[PDB]
Amino acid sequence: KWPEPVFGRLVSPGFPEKYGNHQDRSWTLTAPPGFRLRLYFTHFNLELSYRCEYDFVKLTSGTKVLATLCGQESTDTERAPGNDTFYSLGPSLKVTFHSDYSNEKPFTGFEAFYAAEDVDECRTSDSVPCDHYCHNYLGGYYCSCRVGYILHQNKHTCSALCSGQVFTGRSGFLSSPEYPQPYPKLSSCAYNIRLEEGFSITLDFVESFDVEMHPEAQCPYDSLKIQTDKREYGPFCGKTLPPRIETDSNKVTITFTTDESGNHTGWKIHYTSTAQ
Amino acid sequence: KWPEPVFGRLVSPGFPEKYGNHQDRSWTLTAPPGFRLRLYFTHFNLELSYRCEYDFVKLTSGTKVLATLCGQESTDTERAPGNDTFYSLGPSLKVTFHSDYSNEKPFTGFEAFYAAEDVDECRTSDSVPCDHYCHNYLGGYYCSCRVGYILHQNKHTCSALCSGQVFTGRSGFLSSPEYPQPYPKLSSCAYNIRLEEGFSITLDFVESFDVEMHPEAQCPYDSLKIQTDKREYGPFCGKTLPPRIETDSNKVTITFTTDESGNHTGWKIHYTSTAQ
Ligand SMILES: *[C@@H]1O[C@H](CO)[C@@H](O)[C@H](O)[C@H]1NC(C)=O
Ligand SMILES: *[C@@H]1O[C@H](CO)[C@@H](O)[C@H](O)[C@H]1NC(C)=O
Ligand SMILES: [Ca+2]
Ligand SMILES: [Ca+2]
Ligand SMILES: [Ca+2]
Ligand SMILES: [Ca+2]
Ligand SMILES: [Ca+2]
Ligand SMILES: [Ca+2]
């Protein structure tokens, strides 16, 4: 029915007595997904050989050779456990004991203990899986984002809430989120300047303009586009303030989309109005 | 069927918007046995009052008042969470939000996250539960002992393997385990000096003698007794070398028992032989 927590004890054959010659032991330990295995030795004493060729206790996790332990104390070519802690790479860990044909001294083998352990994905690896807040739990983790933001479909990146602010004043200011700091990733901002009939809106790119532009592809990454009831403008990208735009419309919509990477600082617009 | 891992998110009513007046919220979070709850705030902003009387977020674990959180920053009489981490005392934790009748400023409440977590009984508390080796695992722990020792019935203390060494030489030395260091707890040592018919064994308490003795009860704690086929000797306890014992036997048995506490260094005996 319900599965017991994974933990146990591994020893050399006949422990605490001496271990024999021509012996082989192997254990394949497996934790649930989201869990890894913690292993350590309370006792260790084997035959010393170059690269631990003769007798050895090897720890592997799939293809990765985690350890090859021999002797009593570590050398420049051989390693002894001591009270060090060994962790599996993933939920799996294989432990193998081997002895050759002879043992000059009565080497007394090993005693080691293991237990399943929750992987803390929030502290593992400077390569944070979460854009804003990381939340760890037994056998998993998830991301959240701060105020004015929402968790993206990818369950990691945090998109800004920068859509649906309607401007109705004769003049005002628009800007990418966090301006003049780098605008957030995978965000879709929608600005709507709606004025009464008889007015014309004018847009002025002020201060700074830094939307991600890469060579001979124009703006396939981040895109700043302008739409009126008469025409379209954009996509505007680059590092130079775009020229003044005198729309002959009382309603103007500005859309700003971003990709998955970049530290570009964005844009800022001052809009004004004139009468007929 | 199978129970999901315990984790979740708790917020003030209407979060991220302002929280209202005359509101009350309560959550009783419970982890499995051997697990505790980890709680932290990503957001916190409440009304400040003396000892957080008006509005508050209180954290309790049974009877223990873990926290009473108010305001924005901590004072000398009030506390704000910040990015501090709060742990439950046991598998249970109650979280209570309360607001009074009025809020002068638009206080915007809180956002907090929680998750179940394995209690590490081996690192918790200088009051180690295990005598020798402590081994932690998900939802529990157990003890083991080093070589020459075995785990006692109490699953914690480690008794010495000091029984059944037969002496057959004309002379030799006996001693409490780890002598001249403090003898182990809850141990039962049995020494057997067996010689051929025609010999008489003599016992000499040498060097030092320190068996736990407490006033006017003689030796009810640790007991060193001697048995021959003619009589008995002991129990010997105290801080003075006991007098020489000339047994008229070729077989002598010495039994040494210990209790659950003490740093007494024990005893050492030199036995010899004479002919008829
Ligand atoms: C661990 O530490 C103890 C105490 O320092 C030492 O006696 C022992 O050799 C070390 N290594 C192992 C494998 O126990
Ligand atoms: C946590 O730390 C951040 C960054 O220093 C800070 O802005 C915030 O006020 C702190 N407290 C909470 C509850 O987030
Ligand atoms: Ca060998
Ligand atoms: Ca996890
Ligand atoms: Ca970008
Ligand atoms: Ca209030
Ligand atoms: Ca535990
Ligand atoms: Ca004692």
Side-chain angles (χ1 to χ4, degrees), chain A residues 16-52:
Chain A
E17 290 179 345
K18 79 174 82 171
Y19 67 89
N21 305 320
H22 292 294
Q23 293 182 339
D24 295 277
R25 286 287 205 271
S26 186
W27 299 272
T28 297
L29 314 173
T30 306
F35 295 90
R36 68 176 180 174
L37 297 166
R38 183 181 76 261
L39 189 143
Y40 50 96
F41 292 80
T42 51
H43 191 91
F44 194 91
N45 183 261
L46 266 65
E47 178 187 5
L48 183 64
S49 60
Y50 174 64
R51 290 190 58 191
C52 297

mmCIF file of all heavy atoms in Angstrom, chain A residues 16-52:
data_model
loop_
_atom_site.group_PDB
_atom_site.id
_atom_site.type_symbol
_atom_site.label_atom_id
_atom_site.label_comp_id
_atom_site.label_asym_id
_atom_site.label_seq_id
_atom_site.Cartn_x
_atom_site.Cartn_y
_atom_site.Cartn_z
ATOM 1 N N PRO A 16 31.177 -6.207 11.762
ATOM 2 C CA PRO A 16 32.450 -5.482 11.878
ATOM 3 C C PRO A 16 33.718 -6.315 11.680
ATOM 4 O O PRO A 16 34.809 -5.751 11.752
ATOM 5 C CB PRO A 16 32.400 -4.945 13.309
ATOM 6 C CG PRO A 16 31.628 -5.972 14.045
ATOM 7 C CD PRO A 16 30.578 -6.465 13.084
ATOM 8 N N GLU A 17 33.591 -7.616 11.439
ATOM 9 C CA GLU A 17 34.771 -8.444 11.207
ATOM 10 C C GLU A 17 35.429 -8.093 9.875
ATOM 11 O O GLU A 17 34.877 -7.326 9.085
ATOM 12 C CB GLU A 17 34.412 -9.930 11.242
ATOM 13 C CG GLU A 17 34.051 -10.447 12.624
ATOM 14 C CD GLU A 17 33.687 -11.918 12.618
ATOM 15 O OE1 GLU A 17 33.439 -12.465 11.523
ATOM 16 O OE2 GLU A 17 33.652 -12.527 13.708
ATOM 17 N N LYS A 18 36.613 -8.651 9.637
ATOM 18 C CA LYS A 18 37.358 -8.390 8.411
ATOM 19 C C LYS A 18 36.559 -8.832 7.189
ATOM 20 O O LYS A 18 35.745 -9.753 7.273
ATOM 21 C CB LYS A 18 38.710 -9.109 8.436
ATOM 22 C CG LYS A 18 38.619 -10.592 8.094
ATOM 23 C CD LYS A 18 39.986 -11.249 7.976
ATOM 24 C CE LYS A 18 40.544 -11.625 9.337
ATOM 25 N NZ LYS A 18 41.778 -12.451 9.213
ATOM 26 N N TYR A 19 36.781 -8.171 6.058
ATOM 27 C CA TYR A 19 36.140 -8.590 4.821
ATOM 28 C C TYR A 19 37.065 -9.533 4.056
ATOM 29 O O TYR A 19 38.288 -9.420 4.137
ATOM 30 C CB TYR A 19 35.744 -7.383 3.962
ATOM 31 C CG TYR A 19 36.890 -6.575 3.387
ATOM 32 C CD1 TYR A 19 37.439 -6.893 2.150
ATOM 33 C CD2 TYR A 19 37.401 -5.477 4.065
ATOM 34 C CE1 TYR A 19 38.476 -6.150 1.615
ATOM 35 C CE2 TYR A 19 38.437 -4.728 3.537
ATOM 36 C CZ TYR A 19 38.971 -5.069 2.311
ATOM 37 O OH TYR A 19 40.003 -4.330 1.778
ATOM 38 N N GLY A 20 36.471 -10.472 3.329
ATOM 39 C CA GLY A 20 37.235 -11.504 2.652
ATOM 40 C C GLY A 20 37.739 -11.102 1.281
ATOM 41 O O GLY A 20 37.538 -9.973 0.837
ATOM 42 N N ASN A 21 38.399 -12.040 0.611
ATOM 43 C CA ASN A 21 38.921 -11.806 -0.728
ATOM 44 C C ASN A 21 37.936 -12.272 -1.796
ATOM 45 O O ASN A 21 37.055 -13.088 -1.518
ATOM 46 C CB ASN A 21 40.266 -12.516 -0.903
ATOM 47 C CG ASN A 21 41.274 -12.127 0.165
ATOM 48 O OD1 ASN A 21 41.370 -10.963 0.550
ATOM 49 N ND2 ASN A 21 42.026 -13.107 0.653
ATOM 50 N N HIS A 22 38.089 -11.743 -3.009
ATOM 51 C CA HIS A 22 37.249 -12.110 -4.149
ATOM 52 C C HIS A 22 35.759 -11.913 -3.877
ATOM 53 O O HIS A 22 34.937 -12.744 -4.261
ATOM 54 C CB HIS A 22 37.504 -13.564 -4.558
ATOM 55 C CG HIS A 22 38.862 -13.800 -5.141
ATOM 56 N ND1 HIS A 22 39.259 -13.258 -6.344
ATOM 57 C CD2 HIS A 22 39.911 -14.530 -4.692
ATOM 58 C CE1 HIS A 22 40.496 -13.639 -6.608
ATOM 59 N NE2 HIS A 22 40.915 -14.411 -5.622
ATOM 60 N N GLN A 23 35.415 -10.811 -3.218
ATOM 61 C CA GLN A 23 34.021 -10.530 -2.900
ATOM 62 C C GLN A 23 33.490 -9.346 -3.700
ATOM 63 O O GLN A 23 34.234 -8.428 -4.044
ATOM 64 C CB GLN A 23 33.856 -10.271 -1.402
ATOM 65 C CG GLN A 23 34.103 -11.494 -0.535
ATOM 66 C CD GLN A 23 33.893 -11.216 0.940
ATOM 67 O OE1 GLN A 23 33.944 -10.069 1.383
ATOM 68 N NE2 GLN A 23 33.649 -12.271 1.710
ATOM 69 N N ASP A 24 32.195 -9.379 -3.996
ATOM 70 C CA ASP A 24 31.544 -8.305 -4.735
ATOM 71 C C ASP A 24 30.149 -8.032 -4.185
ATOM 72 O O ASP A 24 29.358 -8.953 -3.980
ATOM 73 C CB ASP A 24 31.463 -8.647 -6.224
ATOM 74 C CG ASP A 24 32.827 -8.746 -6.875
ATOM 75 O OD1 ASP A 24 33.381 -7.692 -7.254
ATOM 76 O OD2 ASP A 24 33.345 -9.875 -7.007
ATOM 77 N N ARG A 25 29.856 -6.759 -3.943
ATOM 78 C CA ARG A 25 28.548 -6.347 -3.449
ATOM 79 C C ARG A 25 28.046 -5.138 -4.223
ATOM 80 O O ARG A 25 28.837 -4.311 -4.675
ATOM 81 C CB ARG A 25 28.610 -6.021 -1.955
ATOM 82 C CG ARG A 25 28.721 -7.228 -1.040
ATOM 83 C CD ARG A 25 27.409 -7.988 -0.963
ATOM 84 N NE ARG A 25 27.292 -8.742 0.283
ATOM 85 C CZ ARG A 25 27.725 -9.987 0.449
ATOM 86 N NH1 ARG A 25 28.308 -10.630 -0.555
ATOM 87 N NH2 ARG A 25 27.576 -10.589 1.620
ATOM 88 N N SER A 26 26.733 -5.031 -4.374
ATOM 89 C CA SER A 26 26.154 -3.901 -5.088
ATOM 90 C C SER A 26 24.754 -3.569 -4.581
ATOM 91 O O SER A 26 23.945 -4.460 -4.322
ATOM 92 C CB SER A 26 26.117 -4.185 -6.590
ATOM 93 O OG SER A 26 25.685 -3.044 -7.309
ATOM 94 N N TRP A 27 24.483 -2.277 -4.439
ATOM 95 C CA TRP A 27 23.176 -1.797 -4.012
ATOM 96 C C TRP A 27 22.703 -0.672 -4.923
ATOM 97 O O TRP A 27 23.446 0.273 -5.188
ATOM 98 C CB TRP A 27 23.220 -1.301 -2.565
ATOM 99 C CG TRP A 27 23.601 -2.340 -1.556
ATOM 100 C CD1 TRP A 27 22.763 -3.198 -0.907
ATOM 101 C CD2 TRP A 27 24.919 -2.617 -1.065
ATOM 102 N NE1 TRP A 27 23.477 -3.999 -0.047
ATOM 103 C CE2 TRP A 27 24.803 -3.663 -0.126
ATOM 104 C CE3 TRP A 27 26.186 -2.088 -1.332
ATOM 105 C CZ2 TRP A 27 25.905 -4.188 0.548
ATOM 106 C CZ3 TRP A 27 27.278 -2.611 -0.661
ATOM 107 C CH2 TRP A 27 27.130 -3.650 0.267
ATOM 108 N N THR A 28 21.469 -0.771 -5.403
ATOM 109 C CA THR A 28 20.881 0.315 -6.174
ATOM 110 C C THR A 28 19.764 0.971 -5.376
ATOM 111 O O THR A 28 18.654 0.445 -5.277
ATOM 112 C CB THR A 28 20.346 -0.165 -7.530
ATOM 113 O OG1 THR A 28 21.435 -0.658 -8.319
ATOM 114 C CG2 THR A 28 19.678 0.983 -8.272
ATOM 115 N N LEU A 29 20.078 2.122 -4.797
ATOM 116 C CA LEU A 29 19.137 2.858 -3.970
ATOM 117 C C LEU A 29 18.394 3.893 -4.807
ATOM 118 O O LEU A 29 18.989 4.569 -5.648
ATOM 119 C CB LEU A 29 19.868 3.526 -2.807
ATOM 120 C CG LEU A 29 20.868 2.637 -2.062
ATOM 121 C CD1 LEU A 29 21.658 3.447 -1.046
ATOM 122 C CD2 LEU A 29 20.159 1.469 -1.391
ATOM 123 N N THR A 30 17.092 4.012 -4.569
ATOM 124 C CA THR A 30 16.245 4.901 -5.353
ATOM 125 C C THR A 30 15.266 5.678 -4.477
ATOM 126 O O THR A 30 14.491 5.093 -3.718
ATOM 127 C CB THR A 30 15.447 4.118 -6.412
ATOM 128 O OG1 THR A 30 16.345 3.335 -7.209
ATOM 129 C CG2 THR A 30 14.671 5.069 -7.310
ATOM 130 N N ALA A 31 15.308 7.000 -4.589
ATOM 131 C CA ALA A 31 14.377 7.871 -3.882
ATOM 132 C C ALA A 31 13.235 8.268 -4.813
ATOM 133 O O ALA A 31 13.351 8.121 -6.028
ATOM 134 C CB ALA A 31 15.103 9.106 -3.357
ATOM 135 N N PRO A 32 12.115 8.750 -4.248
ATOM 136 C CA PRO A 32 11.032 9.273 -5.090
ATOM 137 C C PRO A 32 11.474 10.496 -5.898
ATOM 138 O O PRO A 32 12.478 11.117 -5.550
ATOM 139 C CB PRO A 32 9.948 9.648 -4.073
ATOM 140 C CG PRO A 32 10.225 8.785 -2.895
ATOM 141 C CD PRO A 32 11.717 8.668 -2.833
ATOM 142 N N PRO A 33 10.742 10.831 -6.972
ATOM 143 C CA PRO A 33 11.059 12.033 -7.753
ATOM 144 C C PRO A 33 10.999 13.303 -6.908
ATOM 145 O O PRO A 33 10.058 13.486 -6.139
ATOM 146 C CB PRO A 33 9.978 12.046 -8.844
ATOM 147 C CG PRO A 33 8.912 11.113 -8.358
ATOM 148 C CD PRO A 33 9.628 10.073 -7.564
ATOM 149 N N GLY A 34 12.001 14.163 -7.053
ATOM 150 C CA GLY A 34 12.082 15.375 -6.261
ATOM 151 C C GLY A 34 12.929 15.161 -5.021
ATOM 152 O O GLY A 34 13.235 16.102 -4.292
ATOM 153 N N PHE A 35 13.304 13.908 -4.786
ATOM 154 C CA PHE A 35 14.154 13.558 -3.657
ATOM 155 C C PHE A 35 15.505 13.034 -4.135
ATOM 156 O O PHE A 35 15.616 12.480 -5.229
ATOM 157 C CB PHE A 35 13.472 12.513 -2.766
ATOM 158 C CG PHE A 35 12.219 13.004 -2.092
ATOM 159 C CD1 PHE A 35 10.984 12.865 -2.705
ATOM 160 C CD2 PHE A 35 12.275 13.595 -0.837
ATOM 161 C CE1 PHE A 35 9.828 13.311 -2.084
ATOM 162 C CE2 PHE A 35 11.122 14.046 -0.212
ATOM 163 C CZ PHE A 35 9.898 13.903 -0.835
ATOM 164 N N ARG A 36 16.530 13.219 -3.311
ATOM 165 C CA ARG A 36 17.848 12.660 -3.584
ATOM 166 C C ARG A 36 18.321 11.856 -2.378
ATOM 167 O O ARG A 36 17.668 11.845 -1.334
ATOM 168 C CB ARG A 36 18.855 13.761 -3.920
ATOM 169 C CG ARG A 36 19.186 14.676 -2.752
ATOM 170 C CD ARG A 36 20.270 15.676 -3.120
ATOM 171 N NE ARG A 36 20.589 16.561 -2.007
ATOM 172 C CZ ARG A 36 21.572 17.455 -2.016
ATOM 173 N NH1 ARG A 36 22.344 17.584 -3.086
ATOM 174 N NH2 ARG A 36 21.788 18.217 -0.952
ATOM 175 N N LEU A 37 19.460 11.189 -2.522
ATOM 176 C CA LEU A 37 19.967 10.326 -1.463
ATOM 177 C C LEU A 37 21.205 10.901 -0.782
ATOM 178 O O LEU A 37 22.146 11.337 -1.443
ATOM 179 C CB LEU A 37 20.276 8.939 -2.023
ATOM 180 C CG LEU A 37 19.061 8.198 -2.579
ATOM 181 C CD1 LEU A 37 19.502 7.006 -3.400
ATOM 182 C CD2 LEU A 37 18.143 7.761 -1.449
ATOM 183 N N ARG A 38 21.187 10.896 0.548
ATOM 184 C CA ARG A 38 22.323 11.337 1.348
ATOM 185 C C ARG A 38 23.036 10.127 1.939
ATOM 186 O O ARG A 38 22.413 9.295 2.595
ATOM 187 C CB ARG A 38 21.862 12.281 2.461
ATOM 188 C CG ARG A 38 22.988 12.843 3.312
ATOM 189 C CD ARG A 38 22.469 13.754 4.419
ATOM 190 N NE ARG A 38 21.870 13.006 5.521
ATOM 191 C CZ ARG A 38 20.564 12.819 5.680
ATOM 192 N NH1 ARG A 38 19.708 13.330 4.805
ATOM 193 N NH2 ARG A 38 20.112 12.124 6.713
ATOM 194 N N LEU A 39 24.341 10.028 1.703
ATOM 195 C CA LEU A 39 25.117 8.880 2.160
ATOM 196 C C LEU A 39 26.371 9.319 2.911
ATOM 197 O O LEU A 39 27.018 10.295 2.538
ATOM 198 C CB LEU A 39 25.492 7.988 0.970
ATOM 199 C CG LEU A 39 26.119 6.620 1.259
ATOM 200 C CD1 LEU A 39 25.627 5.595 0.254
ATOM 201 C CD2 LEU A 39 27.639 6.691 1.234
ATOM 202 N N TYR A 40 26.707 8.588 3.971
ATOM 203 C CA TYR A 40 27.907 8.865 4.754
ATOM 204 C C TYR A 40 28.418 7.597 5.429
ATOM 205 O O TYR A 40 27.671 6.638 5.605
ATOM 206 C CB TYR A 40 27.639 9.954 5.800
ATOM 207 C CG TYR A 40 26.404 9.733 6.649
ATOM 208 C CD1 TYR A 40 26.490 9.132 7.899
ATOM 209 C CD2 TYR A 40 25.154 10.146 6.207
ATOM 210 C CE1 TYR A 40 25.360 8.937 8.679
ATOM 211 C CE2 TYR A 40 24.022 9.955 6.978
ATOM 212 C CZ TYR A 40 24.129 9.351 8.211
ATOM 213 O OH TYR A 40 23.001 9.164 8.975
ATOM 214 N N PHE A 41 29.694 7.600 5.799
ATOM 215 C CA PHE A 41 30.319 6.436 6.418
ATOM 216 C C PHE A 41 30.580 6.653 7.906
ATOM 217 O O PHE A 41 31.113 7.688 8.305
ATOM 218 C CB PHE A 41 31.638 6.095 5.718
ATOM 219 C CG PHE A 41 31.473 5.590 4.312
ATOM 220 C CD1 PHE A 41 31.262 6.472 3.263
ATOM 221 C CD2 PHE A 41 31.556 4.236 4.036
ATOM 222 C CE1 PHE A 41 31.120 6.009 1.965
ATOM 223 C CE2 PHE A 41 31.414 3.767 2.742
ATOM 224 C CZ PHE A 41 31.196 4.655 1.706
ATOM 225 N N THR A 42 30.203 5.674 8.723
ATOM 226 C CA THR A 42 30.580 5.679 10.131
ATOM 227 C C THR A 42 31.886 4.917 10.305
ATOM 228 O O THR A 42 32.602 5.109 11.288
ATOM 229 C CB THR A 42 29.497 5.052 11.032
ATOM 230 O OG1 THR A 42 29.128 3.767 10.518
ATOM 231 C CG2 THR A 42 28.268 5.943 11.092
ATOM 232 N N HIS A 43 32.192 4.053 9.340
ATOM 233 C CA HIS A 43 33.432 3.284 9.382
ATOM 234 C C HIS A 43 33.984 3.053 7.979
ATOM 235 O O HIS A 43 33.222 2.826 7.041
ATOM 236 C CB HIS A 43 33.203 1.944 10.085
ATOM 237 C CG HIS A 43 34.464 1.204 10.407
ATOM 238 N ND1 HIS A 43 35.129 1.354 11.605
ATOM 239 C CD2 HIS A 43 35.179 0.304 9.690
ATOM 240 C CE1 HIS A 43 36.200 0.580 11.612
ATOM 241 N NE2 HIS A 43 36.253 -0.068 10.462
ATOM 242 N N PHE A 44 35.304 3.114 7.833
ATOM 243 C CA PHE A 44 35.932 2.838 6.544
ATOM 244 C C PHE A 44 37.409 2.484 6.685
ATOM 245 O O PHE A 44 38.197 3.249 7.242
ATOM 246 C CB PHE A 44 35.777 4.031 5.599
ATOM 247 C CG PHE A 44 36.092 3.707 4.168
ATOM 248 C CD1 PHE A 44 35.092 3.290 3.305
ATOM 249 C CD2 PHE A 44 37.387 3.807 3.687
ATOM 250 C CE1 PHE A 44 35.378 2.986 1.987
ATOM 251 C CE2 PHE A 44 37.679 3.505 2.370
ATOM 252 C CZ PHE A 44 36.674 3.093 1.520
ATOM 253 N N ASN A 45 37.774 1.320 6.158
ATOM 254 C CA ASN A 45 39.143 0.829 6.203
ATOM 255 C C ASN A 45 39.347 -0.256 5.151
ATOM 256 O O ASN A 45 38.933 -1.404 5.337
ATOM 257 C CB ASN A 45 39.482 0.295 7.596
ATOM 258 C CG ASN A 45 40.924 -0.167 7.712
ATOM 259 O OD1 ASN A 45 41.217 -1.359 7.616
ATOM 260 N ND2 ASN A 45 41.831 0.778 7.922
ATOM 261 N N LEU A 46 39.970 0.126 4.041
ATOM 262 C CA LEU A 46 40.209 -0.789 2.929
ATOM 263 C C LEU A 46 41.681 -0.829 2.540
ATOM 264 O O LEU A 46 42.502 -0.097 3.089
ATOM 265 C CB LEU A 46 39.369 -0.388 1.713
ATOM 266 C CG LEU A 46 38.002 -1.046 1.513
ATOM 267 C CD1 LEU A 46 37.032 -0.676 2.625
ATOM 268 C CD2 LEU A 46 37.433 -0.669 0.152
ATOM 269 N N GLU A 47 42.004 -1.693 1.583
ATOM 270 C CA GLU A 47 43.358 -1.784 1.054
ATOM 271 C C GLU A 47 43.665 -0.588 0.160
ATOM 272 O O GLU A 47 42.842 -0.192 -0.666
ATOM 273 C CB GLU A 47 43.542 -3.087 0.270
ATOM 274 C CG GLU A 47 44.915 -3.246 -0.360
ATOM 275 C CD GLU A 47 45.000 -4.455 -1.269
ATOM 276 O OE1 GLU A 47 43.960 -5.114 -1.477
ATOM 277 O OE2 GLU A 47 46.104 -4.746 -1.775
ATOM 278 N N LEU A 48 44.851 -0.015 0.331
ATOM 279 C CA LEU A 48 45.277 1.102 -0.499
ATOM 280 C C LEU A 48 45.978 0.608 -1.761
ATOM 281 O O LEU A 48 46.860 -0.247 -1.699
ATOM 282 C CB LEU A 48 46.200 2.036 0.285
ATOM 283 C CG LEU A 48 46.664 3.298 -0.447
ATOM 284 C CD1 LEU A 48 45.487 4.211 -0.758
ATOM 285 C CD2 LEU A 48 47.719 4.033 0.363
ATOM 286 N N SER A 49 45.567 1.149 -2.902
ATOM 287 C CA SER A 49 46.197 0.848 -4.182
ATOM 288 C C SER A 49 46.080 2.063 -5.096
ATOM 289 O O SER A 49 45.285 2.961 -4.825
ATOM 290 C CB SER A 49 45.558 -0.379 -4.833
ATOM 291 O OG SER A 49 44.175 -0.174 -5.064
ATOM 292 N N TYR A 50 46.865 2.094 -6.169
ATOM 293 C CA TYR A 50 46.832 3.229 -7.088
ATOM 294 C C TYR A 50 45.467 3.368 -7.746
ATOM 295 O O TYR A 50 44.965 2.426 -8.361
ATOM 296 C CB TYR A 50 47.908 3.108 -8.165
ATOM 297 C CG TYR A 50 47.797 4.189 -9.218
ATOM 298 C CD1 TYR A 50 47.985 5.525 -8.888
ATOM 299 C CD2 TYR A 50 47.494 3.875 -10.536
ATOM 300 C CE1 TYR A 50 47.879 6.520 -9.844
ATOM 301 C CE2 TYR A 50 47.388 4.863 -11.499
ATOM 302 C CZ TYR A 50 47.580 6.184 -11.147
ATOM 303 O OH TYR A 50 47.475 7.169 -12.102
ATOM 304 N N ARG A 51 44.879 4.555 -7.603
ATOM 305 C CA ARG A 51 43.525 4.838 -8.072
ATOM 306 C C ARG A 51 42.511 3.833 -7.526
ATOM 307 O O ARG A 51 41.463 3.606 -8.136
ATOM 308 C CB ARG A 51 43.475 4.859 -9.602
ATOM 309 C CG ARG A 51 44.182 6.047 -10.236
ATOM 310 C CD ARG A 51 43.886 6.122 -11.725
ATOM 311 N NE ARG A 51 42.451 6.214 -11.981
ATOM 312 C CZ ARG A 51 41.894 6.087 -13.182
ATOM 313 N NH1 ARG A 51 42.651 5.859 -14.248
ATOM 314 N NH2 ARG A 51 40.579 6.184 -13.316
ATOM 315 N N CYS A 52 42.832 3.250 -6.372
ATOM 316 C CA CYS A 52 41.997 2.239 -5.728
ATOM 317 C C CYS A 52 41.619 1.123 -6.697
ATOM 318 O O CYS A 52 40.440 0.847 -6.921
ATOM 319 C CB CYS A 52 40.742 2.883 -5.135
ATOM 320 S SG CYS A 52 41.093 4.074 -3.823
#
